[PDB]
């Protein structure tokens with residue numbers, strides 16, 4: 001999971 | 005396009 | 009010896025979400041209490057262990073309407089349906105418990121994982 | 132304020148290709164000369180300008196069989212159909228002209244681009  |  | 013187009017899968021998913029927004033080729037309505045959500049069975053199966061089981065069933069595969077358990081929260085479902093079609097999860101303090109319970113029911117293991125990690129960090 | 136699952140779009144596409152291999156929820160046959168290819172209309176539209184135009188047509192959207200131009204090569208179509216469902220393009224010296232002509236007909240601009248670049252490098 002990432003900060004887009 | 006890339007070499008996978 | 010294939011070559012691969014990096015952005016292809018994201019581009020496909022963007023166009024599947026465009027089809028959903030325009031209600032094109034949607035073949036099922038998911039009923040969650042008083043709310044209805046139109047979707048593509050193939051995308052639902054591809055994202056969810058529950059829908060994969062439902063739509064591989066020789067009788068349920070032909071249903072145009074699927075009713076979810078009355079304990080399922082419509083907003084939690086809405087957030088997960090948006091995630092299915094975009095890879096983006098609108099996870100907030102106010103919705104995290106509903107999102108996690110919905111993801112457990114829908115059998116969306118990666119969403120459950122992250123909800124567990126975000127909850128553990130706040131305690 | 133969304134979070135994003137990097138591998139989600141690739142995972143969706145992998146499961147759509149699994150559905151195609153098992154012939155689950157395929158809703159169209161594409162006929163290319165003597166060969167037939169089963170697919171999902173939603174994936175075809177998402178990858179191809181030609182299928183996007185065909186399946187948004189108020190009459191063609193309901194067809195179970197689509198016949199392509201007799202000049203279209205079945206292997207070229209097969210390679211592009213595999214690309215649609217995997218992001219992988221099996222581009223070879225022996226098939227590049229057929230792949231490029233098929234991609235131009237199918238309106239798959241990124242495939243056309245790369246075929247043009249691979250041809251330019253060999254001349």
Ligand SMILES: N#Cc1cnn2c(Nc3ccc4c(c3)CC(=O)N4)cc(Cl)nc12
Pocket residue numbers: 053054055056057058060115116117118146147149150151153155
């Ligand atoms: N054919 C086919 C096909 C279509 N969909 N699909 C799967 N869909 C799925 C099943 C379980 C889970 C998820 C997705 C996300 C998750 O957390 N669990 C799996 C397989 Cl092995 N095959 C298929």
Ligand SMILES: N#Cc1cnn2c(Nc3ccc4c(c3)CC(=O)N4)cc(Cl)nc12
Pocket residue numbers: 023024026027028030032176177178179180181183238239240241
């Ligand atoms: N709704 C919808 C929807 C479904 N599919 N789709 C598009 N599919 C497409 C159209 C043209 C081209 C390609 C894909 C690859 C290419 O080279 N050209 C576009 C839009 Cl703007 N919208 C949609």
Ligand SMILES: [Cl-]
Pocket residue numbers: 055116117118119120
């Ligand atoms: Cl997931």
Ligand SMILES: [Cl-]
Pocket residue numbers: 178239240241242243
């Ligand atoms: Cl393309």
